[PDB]
Ligand binder design. Sequence first.
Ligand SMILES: O=C(O)[C@@](O)(C[C@@H](O)[C@@H](O)[C@H](O)[C@H](O)COP(=O)(O)O)OP(=O)(O)O
Ligand SMILES: O=P(O)(O)OC[C@@H](O)[C@@H](O)[C@H](O)CO
Ligand SMILES: O=P(O)(O)OC[C@@H](O)[C@@H](O)[C@H](O)CO
Ligand SMILES: O=P(O)(O)OC[C@@H](O)[C@@H](O)[C@H](O)CO
Lengths: 262, 262, 262, 262
Amino acid sequence: KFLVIAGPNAIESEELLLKVGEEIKRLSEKFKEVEFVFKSSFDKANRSSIHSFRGHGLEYGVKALRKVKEEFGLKITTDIHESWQAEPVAEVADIIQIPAFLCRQTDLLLAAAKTGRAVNVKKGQFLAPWDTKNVVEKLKFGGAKEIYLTERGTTFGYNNLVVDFRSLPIMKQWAKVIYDATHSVQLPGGLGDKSGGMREFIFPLIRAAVAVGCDGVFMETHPEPEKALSDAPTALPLSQLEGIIEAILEIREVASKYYETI
Amino acid sequence: KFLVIAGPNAIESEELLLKVGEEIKRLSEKFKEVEFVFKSSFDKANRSSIHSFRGHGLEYGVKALRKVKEEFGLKITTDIHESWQAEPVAEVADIIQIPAFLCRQTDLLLAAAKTGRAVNVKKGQFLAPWDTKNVVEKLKFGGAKEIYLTERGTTFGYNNLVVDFRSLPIMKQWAKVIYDATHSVQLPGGLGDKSGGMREFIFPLIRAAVAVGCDGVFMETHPEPEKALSDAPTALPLSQLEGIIEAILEIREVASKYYETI
Amino acid sequence: KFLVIAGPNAIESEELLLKVGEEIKRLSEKFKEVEFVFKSSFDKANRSSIHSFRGHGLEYGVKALRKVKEEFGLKITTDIHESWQAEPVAEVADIIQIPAFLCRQTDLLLAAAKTGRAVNVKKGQFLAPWDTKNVVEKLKFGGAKEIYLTERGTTFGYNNLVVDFRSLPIMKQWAKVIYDATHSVQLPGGLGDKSGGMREFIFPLIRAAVAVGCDGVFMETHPEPEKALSDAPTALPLSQLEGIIEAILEIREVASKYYETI
Amino acid sequence: KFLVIAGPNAIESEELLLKVGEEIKRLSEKFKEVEFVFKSSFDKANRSSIHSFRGHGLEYGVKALRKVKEEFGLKITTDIHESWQAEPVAEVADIIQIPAFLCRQTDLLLAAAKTGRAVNVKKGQFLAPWDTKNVVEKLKFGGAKEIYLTERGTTFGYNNLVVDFRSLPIMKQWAKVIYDATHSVQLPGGLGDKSGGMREFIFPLIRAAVAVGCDGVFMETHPEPEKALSDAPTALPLSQLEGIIEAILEIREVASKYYETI
Ligand SMILES: O=C(O)[C@@](O)(C[C@@H](O)[C@@H](O)[C@H](O)[C@H](O)COP(=O)(O)O)OP(=O)(O)O
Ligand SMILES: O=P(O)(O)OC[C@@H](O)[C@@H](O)[C@H](O)CO
Ligand SMILES: O=P(O)(O)OC[C@@H](O)[C@@H](O)[C@H](O)CO
Ligand SMILES: O=P(O)(O)OC[C@@H](O)[C@@H](O)[C@H](O)CO
């Protein structure tokens, strides 16, 4: 079944996680043919500015995520930034996410693989799609069995990203492919001491992704997007999720017959 | 009414245009909800090598096209390279095509617009999406009424092009958008003396194109791509043209329920 | 000896040409080691906006250029846009310049080559260094003996150019290399319907160019750049030309010892 | 006092370090106007392949570097990859280097600044020159007093980097600037499961850098480049360093007066 990874970008509070988890649960009940994974970062370790919001700590985060998992029965995913975080995070995370800037850090990859959990690596903005085969090679060597590669855009000049959709079938040769719909339209460090984003392109590019063919979509959401303490320019209003999920499934159903084999 | 512009890249010979034109004709009969337009250049005025096939002259070109037109009742389109070719080409071409490298040449556009025919400007590999606004403004000034903007990729490093699908909804603000499925996967000077390409990506990107939303697609075809006198690595096998058309109509029927409003 | 092509971007008035032509003449006598050449276009054939200055016609153009050539004795150079402007323009211009966007237009090259003059091709923003080889091959085929290739930046994302200095030592393998100091720092379409730029980086990159090794510098100047009718943001005040020219000679003096031998 | 940071890329053995160190020591004696810093990584933590050489461990590396410092009295610099490494490395390192892919990891920058040692951040291949201001701001927040920013190229298409020399003047506004002559000509993932490089452009671009104006140069060397355990296609022959350093000082002497005031 198609994978939908969604949640608020950062764990601003567990009240937030619960409110968003409530909607994700409703969506999981409505879309039985979709595997929903709740995502939220316990820490924003790569913010452009030392003044920006980071989070409330790994432990608080794991606790908030566990609360969502137990209250709504949803699978969880969160990212790690240094090797020691793999083990404590694997306690609650079904899927351990590896940040794009850190996609080549061997030890971080081996540490995630060692937990036995699934691993999803965001493709670096500096990495060519063919260069991802080696990334999968490290994770396999380390013992990983469920492996994902996420498309989140490529460096195109300064403060801008372009999505080379050719990367979807190329990467599918070595792993399941996830399309990060929110960060692919993000304009890196575009707002001075923060990054920007163009929400108007989120939906059309998602349509493109499922038309080309991928195994899932990653999309951040928030009850009040403009108020998000991280990635404000990109979060999708909670109410828009249902409509976009519906479109995804409908487009996939008519295009899947044309997806290239192997 | 979806627009499909197809045909052999260059006017290699009468037999070529006729063999393709009849296949195009047959398709125009089966897919009545589509508006077909026959394409073919009478001269490749910008090859890499001085030893590469260019054409059999403008006279032999306008003549060969008139044959396909009067024999199959198909609309016609071909590209002009210098101001003077505007009037003489317009005698057969319903749509005058402006080369990618020339999208900024004021007079060429001005001349094509005066002929009263439809103008289709290919976006330059060096042009940003929002910069097409000035291109449309010129053509209107010159009296053009039916204006098209064609997406054919953007310079991404050396000998490579990427398709920034954000350009479709951006250029649609001031003109109808066509997606060039063949040149968008072309590798500029990829072979030193001649350009290269990756046919394996033509179809997947066409699918993204229509899922995103465009008014039509541009496809170059040939009975045996391998033997094409130019763009051989990008030409689509004439026998695959039907399956592709049917695929996009199916995808378009479903995706159109979601195209944003401009 | 070292080549320095300077002058107003556009022939705004022979008054301007002569005024600048005055200062150039002066520097031409002070730097007997340098080979000066007056440059100016009679028509900006590729402006972004239909409402932007273009010039006063090829007639008034070739006219003013002669007035400067006969009164100051300086060589002249100007750019052609269509094949029919070669023969006529080749009357006053010592070196025929081929615009960047038109660097692959075969007939335009062959046209400038037949006139017997020297041809200076602006390297396309979409062209790789090694691909200029064929550009020269066309000129040699057309009868050109004195061929130049001018580095003027490469497409780096949208509305931005980057100078890949590796190009100097690569293109030098088959033609004399000139570095365009003014347009290498321009921002294409940076002002909406007008191009922008930042003159703050012109001198620094000039030093880089001579340090790396090139045969000449191309830099447009103007009495009051702020009032220029074209490429205003990239015009060097007239009073700074002397200093920059002195700097170039000193750096070339010390660095030439290391230029890689071809 | 121009900074020349040089040494073998990785600590292949304590023996290789003393061999290169003996030479760095010789150069520090011949060029007393230059400040030399010996560099070598105790771990290549971001190799493309799980099969490539990484190193002999932090303990062994710190011991190897301390032997060089003690025996030759040279300053030492090496890079770190996780926060816990800062302190032990600070025991020997005069300058703590931050890898390019990790230039935005807040905790690693803070760990390095907290040691009280100088910090040199390699500018990420995805970072715009102006984005480095926040980098410096994080370092000052962490307590760093001596800060460096190193230019090592920018992502240009796939498997290729380009040096935007406009970054030198830009970054100089916030910190001292170093030009990495070795990695700026590196070709990311170019060799499949390894990276390639164009050594032929190393010297040319170093000349450019000093011509433009920087505070120092970074150059990796090796007695037998072909046999280096990492970045082999970019290591300079140990015997060629002297000639290059001499050229640097010569070009810097003349160019220095033209350096614009920040
Ligand atoms: O030497 C030249 O005149 C010129 O640099 C051409 C240049 O003058 C024009 O391209 C000019 O920069 C352009 O027309 C400005 O466009 P606006 O966006 O309307 O400002 O030669 P190129 O072919 O390298 O661009
Ligand atoms: O501090 P800024 O520039 O907004 O950086 C945003 C990133 O932290 C953010 O995109 C993160 O990578 C994803 O959640
Ligand atoms: O000479 P090559 O590099 O093959 O390209 C020739 C061009 O005329 C051709 O690509 C044209 O632009 C498209 O049909
Ligand atoms: O050959 P590969 O494994 O790609 O290594 C690339 C290097 O740039 C990387 O290991 C590191 O930056 C070395 O200095």
